[PDB]
Design a protein around this ligand. Structure first.
Ligand code: ATP
Ligand code: MG
Lengths: 127, 468, 41, 40, 578
């Protein structure tokens, strides 16, 4: 006779899961819509300057073809070589001095790495 | 946070691989291994140096190569991620949900290895737990904060006893006389090396009586990766101690089979070529088991508690086997099953003569239970031992030499094994068990109950047979 | 009979332990001779 | 006595509807918070 | 100081490079958190350091610094009533600084620097001092703590602080060469403290347990080993010794054992009373706790710290009892460290030098004349935990070659709830002959003969029990049946002892002597009655047997009159039977 409470709890949990999935879809759309906004050229600059300093020494920098026009200047300023990659999207990648180590700074990876930490915060604030 | 990829893989063989240019990898860190096909595996750093770092792969190394494989860092310390909503959920050995419901939202992330408890911070266990079994509640009483394993064999029904204890566990706050509110009670149930049949049995048993509503299940199957069997008790204990020491829960932890854990530990240790022990088990097995068992206890200034009931199977019923032997050196007693009682059809087949509870003397008495518990337990043990001695004597020189007292003890032993131990599936209370114990104590002469004081005799020496 | 059986299994366990120790020593010495002949270069 | 579960089913549906309607009005603030936390 | 960086991390072992100039067995601080370690191997410009703490999360390249000094303990006022970890850190301070969990990297002084002590000088300016000489006294929980010159210090006194209150850091005495003597000094735990001379043990170590104090005695300054399987009662016996023995100071080392057993002492001892002096029992005890889940390498440090503290308290002129909860755990740590070094094992994986370590540890016990010219003693009782109860295990066999007493525990007795459960047929003692004059002077003139008679009766019972098991009691004559019944009475009414009963937990020597005399008197009278044709079944029904069985529960105050009444009843019962 107490299975009704179990059904209520399961329904609440599934509703919360669906809400979080909707939030994830909205965040994905907002992140993938970045290339159409004026903050985007500064965001890629920030990512490039962070990537080139995470590695103590960078042999070359790999950038998306649409992103390199906004970062060629500090590509020459830092003194590292510039390399293009059509496959790289929503960020830039750096290559270490010895060629063994590379660091990636794409926004999708950042979302994947940070959503499991901020899910509790967004749930607490939303509800 | 950025992502770092290490591609300098220089050597792969067995479960190990070497990364040469990875000085930044801390010792014991958890890493992700990704191959050319995009599949991701897990690993742990077991040794780090300037030349290379050695990573132990959680799964098999099939499909890896030195050209396309890359290694990335996940975290420096293995964190679980816990929440108070885990009650009623069902997870695998690595913590992923397997019940179909969506994943939880972590209130906190805690290291799964834990930290040792400061002895100055501990306090003496003081309160008992009603398991619903007379042989345990009366003679081998379990105390909140104790480690008390169950020793079983091959065909003995350990799983049924574990499920029954999980279903019937209660705290009985009324007997404390303090009148405080009933404290929250929860069960953390960790299963290692379980087949599909036993998995279905446990799921049905938990869902039959609604005990799942106050339980957290960690289920590791026999076909799962070996490393998952190692981490399951640590996940269970992390959840248990989080609940106990941050929400004042009284948590009962049950580990279904430590023999499978020991086999997994032996395999993993032998993969790394450590110095073998007595029967191939690693030499550090005592420390490894201690780091699991020692996490139970009670803390001064806190209301919660953690209780552990490990279950293990003695190989060939040899109590001197390394697994039960090392388990005994850590815990505070043992409950031992008997094959003779199993042949007689007795359930649960707990043999009270070789069983013991070290913390029992502090968990029972006036205010904790009825005031005659200790004396009746002692008298029951003495009388049953006398009856067993009479049985052993009869089977050699014949029954005809028996004195009236000897045959009285002989029949008392049979009545004991038929009524006190053979309870079936009943959820006996402590008062019911004490009433039954007094009922068959009255089977003996009043002057023969030497251990019991005169004041409890007459008050409880009712000279009545069992009403069941 | 049970005492004799227990003695037999105890002796078997001791012998197996000694054999395992000998195998470990053999592996150690093979590893070290390989290491010598390699690192001597 | 077999018709008990229907009322709990409809109550669970009502509770889920209440939770989702509470969530709908505030999704944008949470999305803005996520974008603020992720973006450099 | 020598300063290097981490080259390799593997378990509890760390290899540092750039450490050219570091010395063997010096203390090093590893990593950014400064974890304590010790050098055990030097090779090239590298050093091999075993870390006494958790090494998880360390990275290659972190700094390593060498302190230039070996592992040492601080010896001075403030050790009694305290509890310490493996490397002598106060656990109460660690709790009040870091909560309920023991975290690594905590630095705190062993002796409190804020407490002030009532200093009373005893030396005058211009006096010639030497190692071990008494400079002054300090009250310590009712003890008179003596401030000792460090063993390797010589000079002439130039200045003495007057009476007053000072901290342990105060330079109370200054020599003419500029050396300042404080209330405390440091000593390497791996060096035995020197003594003038070692004496022969001729006084008993009264444990308060009948079987050990009578059948297998140990003398002051002696050594005993108590091996046994799990559940046999090593911990209960050791706690009973720590609660009832006549030692001045008790040092308890929890080497790798459970934490609840260490919590029990802290909870209970402050409420019990010292048998030798008023005041709580905890003022007598120093605890060294390193539980099972604490770092493995700290067990050896625990053992050495405990033995060094025992040596210091001996040097002050006391008689100290040292209990080691399990040396098998220390052997396990040695095996693990040897495995990290890739050494060749001897057998069962233990390093070949295990026996030397055990002998060096056990040889620190003994009754000595201190450097200050007064008597002191250290008695060591060390428990062993053989795997599966196998007595051929290397640790047990190595221990049995150096100890003077062997208290073997039996699992068969323990599984029948027969405690203390010493196997009286497998045990032995080598101090029994040297203690006879003391027994004659202090207990009774004929005590050794009574003890020999009891042992002979036990031997005869043992030699009859197999015949009983083979043919059955019914075919035996009255004489051997009486022997069997007397052996049963001895086993169940003299050897048995409840460590939790209020009265039966402790037993004086005179009480055991009285019980033995009662048993022998009853045996003599029953033998005479049997020779007079009286049925043994009639003898078994005599009511005086209950008086004999109930004797051990009688309090010490009431025992002398109870003994006379029982002897009169014993003689009268067979006198009336005729
Ligand atoms: N002298 C005694 N009197 C009464 N009970 C005893 C006595 N000795 C042992 N016991 C009982 O037996 C139990 C086992 O004793 P104890 O804990 O000292 O064993 P141990 O040999 O130290 O075991 P372990 O190797 O597992 O640490 C005790 O908890 C107690 O219940
Ligand atoms: Mg013990």
């Amino acid at each position: 006779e107490s299975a009704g409470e179990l059904l209520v709890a399961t329904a609440r949990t599934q509703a919360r899961g669906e809400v979080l999935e909707e939030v994830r879809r909205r965040v994905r759309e907002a992140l993938e819509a970045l290339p159409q906004k004026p903050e985007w050229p500064e965001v890629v600059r920030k990512l490039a300057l962070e990537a080139l300093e995470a590695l103590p020494g960078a042999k070359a920098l790999v950038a998306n073809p649409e992103d390199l026009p906004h970062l060629e200047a500090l590509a020459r300023e830092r003194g590292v070589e510039l390399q293009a990659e059509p496959a790289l999207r929503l960020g830039v990648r750096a290559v270490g001095a010895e060629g063994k180590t590379q660091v990636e700074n794409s926004l999708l990876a950042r979302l994947d790495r940070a959503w499991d930490a901020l899910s509790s915060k967004v749930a607490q604030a939303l509800w | 946070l950025l992502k770092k990829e290490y591609t300098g893989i220089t050597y792969i063989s067995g479960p190990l691989l070497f990364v040469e240019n990875a000085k930044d990898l801390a010792y014991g860190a958890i890493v992700d291994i990704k191959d050319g096909t995009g599949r991701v595996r897990g690993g742990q750093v077991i040794e780090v140096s300037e030349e290379y770092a050695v990573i132990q792969v959680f799964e098999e190394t099939t499909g890896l190569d030195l050209a396309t494989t890359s290694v990335s860092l996940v975290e420096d310390v293995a964190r679980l991620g816990v929440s108070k909503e885990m009650l009623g959920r069902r997870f695998n050995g690595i913590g992923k949900p397997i019940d179909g419901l969506p994943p939880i939202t972590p209130e906190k992330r805690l290291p799964i290895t834990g930290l040792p408890l400061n002895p100055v911070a501990r306090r003496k266990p003081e309160q008992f737990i009603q398991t619903g079994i007379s042989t345990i509640d009366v003679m081998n009483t379990l105390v909140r904060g104790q480690k008390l394993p169950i020793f079983s064999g091959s065909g003995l029904p350990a799983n049924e006893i574990a499920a029954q204890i999980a279903r019937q566990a209660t705290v009985r706050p009324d007997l404390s006389g303090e009148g405080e509110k009933e404290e929250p009670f929860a069960v953390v149930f960790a299963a290692m090396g379980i087949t599909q049949r036993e998995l279905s049995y446990f799921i049905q048993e938990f869902e039959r009586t609604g005990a799942l509503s106050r339980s957290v299940l960690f289920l590791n199957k026999a076909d799962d990766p070996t490393i998952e069997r190692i981490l399951t008790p640590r996940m269970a204990l992390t959840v248990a101690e989080y609940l106990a020491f941050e929400h004042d829960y009284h948590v009962l932890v049950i580990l279904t089979d430590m023999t499978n854990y020991c086999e997994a530990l032996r395999e993993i240790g032998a993969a790394r070529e450590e110095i073998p022990g007595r029967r191939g088990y690693p030499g550090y097995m005592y420390t490894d088991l201690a780091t699991i068992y020692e996490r139970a206890g009670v803390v001064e200034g806190k209301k919660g508690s953690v209780t552990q009931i490990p279950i293990l199977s003695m190989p060939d019923d040899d109590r001197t086997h390394p697994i039960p032997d090392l388990t005994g050196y850590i815990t505070e007693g043992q409950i031992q099953l008997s094959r003779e009682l199993h042949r007689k059809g007795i359930y649960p087949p707990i043999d009270p003569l070789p069983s013991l509870s070290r913390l029992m003397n502090n968990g029972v008495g006036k205010g904790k239970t009825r005031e005659d518990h200790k004396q009746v337990s002692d008298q029951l043990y003495s009388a049953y031992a006398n009856g067993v001695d009479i049985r052993k004597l009869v089977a050699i020189i014949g029954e005809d030499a028996l004195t009236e007292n000897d045959r009285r003890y002989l029949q008392f032993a049979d009545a004991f094994e038929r009524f006190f131990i053979n309870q079936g599936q009943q959820n006996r209370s402590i008062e019911e068990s004490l009433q039954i114990a007094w009922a068959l104590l009255s089977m003996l002469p009043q002057g023969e109950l030497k251990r019991i004081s005169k004041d409890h005799i007459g008050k409880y020496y009712g000279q009545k047979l069992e009403e069941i | 009979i049970p005492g004799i059986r227990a003695q037999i299994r105890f002796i078997q366990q001791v012998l197996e332990q000694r054999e395992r120790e000998d195998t470990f020593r053999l592996k150690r010495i093979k590893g070290k001779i390989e290491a010598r002949e390699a690192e001597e270069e | 006595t077999e018709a008990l579960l229907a009322r709990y089913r409809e109550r669970a549906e009502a509770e889920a509807k209440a939770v989702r309607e509470k969530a709908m009005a505030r999704l944008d603030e949470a999305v803005a918070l996520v974008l603020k936390e992720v973006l450099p | 100081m020598i300063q290097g960086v981490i080259q390799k991390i593997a378990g509890p072992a760390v290899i540092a490079k750039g450490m050219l100039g570091a010395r063997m067995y010096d203390i090093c601080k590893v990593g950014e958190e400064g974890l304590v370690g010790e050098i055990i191997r030097l090779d090239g410009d590298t050093a091999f350091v075993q870390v006494y703490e958790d090494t998880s999360g360390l990275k290659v390249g972190e700094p390593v610094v060498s302190t230039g000094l070996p592992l040492a303990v601080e010896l001075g006022p403030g050790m009694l009533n305290g509890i310490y970890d493996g490397i002598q850190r106060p656990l109460e301070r660690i709790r009040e600084k870091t909560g309920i969990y023991i975290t690594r990297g905590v630095v705190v002084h062993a002796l409190d620097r804020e407490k002030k002590w009532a200093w009373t000088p005893m030396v005058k300016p211009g006096d010639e001092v030497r190692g071990g000489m008494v400079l002054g006294t300090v009250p310590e929980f009712g003890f008179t703590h003596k401030i000792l010159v460090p063993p390797d210090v010589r000079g002439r006194v130039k200045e003495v602080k007057p009476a007053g209150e000072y901290t342990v850091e105060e330079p109370v005495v200054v020599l003419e060469d500029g050396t300042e003597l404080k209330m405390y000094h440091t000593w390497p735990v791996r060096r035995a403290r020197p003594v003038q001379r070692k004496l022969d043990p001729n006084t008993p170590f009264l444990t308060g347990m009948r079987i050990l104090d009578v059948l297998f005695p140990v003398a002051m300054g002696g050594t005993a080993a108590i091996p046994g399987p799990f559940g046999a009662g090593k911990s209960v016996t050791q706690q009973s010794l720590a609660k009832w023995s006549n030692a001045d100071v008790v040092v308890y080392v929890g080497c790798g054992e459970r934490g609840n057993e260490m919590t029990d002492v802290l909870v209970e001892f402050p409420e019990l009373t010292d048998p030798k002096t008023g005041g709580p029992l905890m003022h007598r005890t120093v605890l060294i706790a390193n539980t099972s889940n604490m770092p493995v390498a700290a067990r050896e440090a625990s053992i050495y710290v405990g033995v060094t503290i025992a040596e210091y308290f001996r040097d002050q002129g006391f008689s100290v009892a040292l209990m080691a909860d399990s040396t098998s755990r220390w052997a396990e740590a040695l095996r693990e460290i040897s495995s990290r070094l890739e050494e060749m094992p001897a057998e069962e994986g233990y390093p070949p030098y295990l026996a030397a370590r055990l002998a060096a540890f056990y040889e620190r016990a003994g009754k000595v004349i201190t450097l200050g010219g007064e008597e002191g003693a250290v008695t060591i009782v060390g428990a062993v935990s053989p795997p599966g109860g196998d007595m051929s295990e290397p640790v047990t066999q190595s221990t049995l070659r150096i100890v003077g007493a062997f208290w073997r525990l039996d699992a068969s007795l323990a599984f029948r709830r027969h405690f203390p459960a010493i196997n009286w047929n497998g045990s032995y003692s080598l101090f029994t002959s040297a203690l006879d004059p003391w027994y004659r002077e202090n207990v009774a003139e004929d005590y050794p003969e009574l003890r020999d008679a009891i042992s002979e009766l036990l031997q005869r019972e043992a030699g009859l029990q197999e015949i009983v098991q083979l043919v059955g009691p019914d075919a035996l004559q009255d004489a051997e049946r009486l022997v069997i019944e007397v052996g049963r009475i001895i086993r169940e009414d003299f050897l048995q002892q409840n460590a939790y009963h209020e009265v039966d937990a402790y037993c004086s020597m005179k009480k055991a002597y009285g019980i033995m005399k009662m048993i022998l008197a009853f045996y003599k009278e029953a033998e005479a009655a049997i020779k007079r044709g009286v049925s043994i079944d009639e003898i078994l029904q005599l009511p005086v047997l209950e008086r004999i069985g109930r004797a051990r529960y009688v309090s010490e105050e009431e025992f002398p009159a109870y003994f006379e009444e029982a002897m009169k009843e014993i003689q009268g019962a067979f006198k009336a039977l005729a």
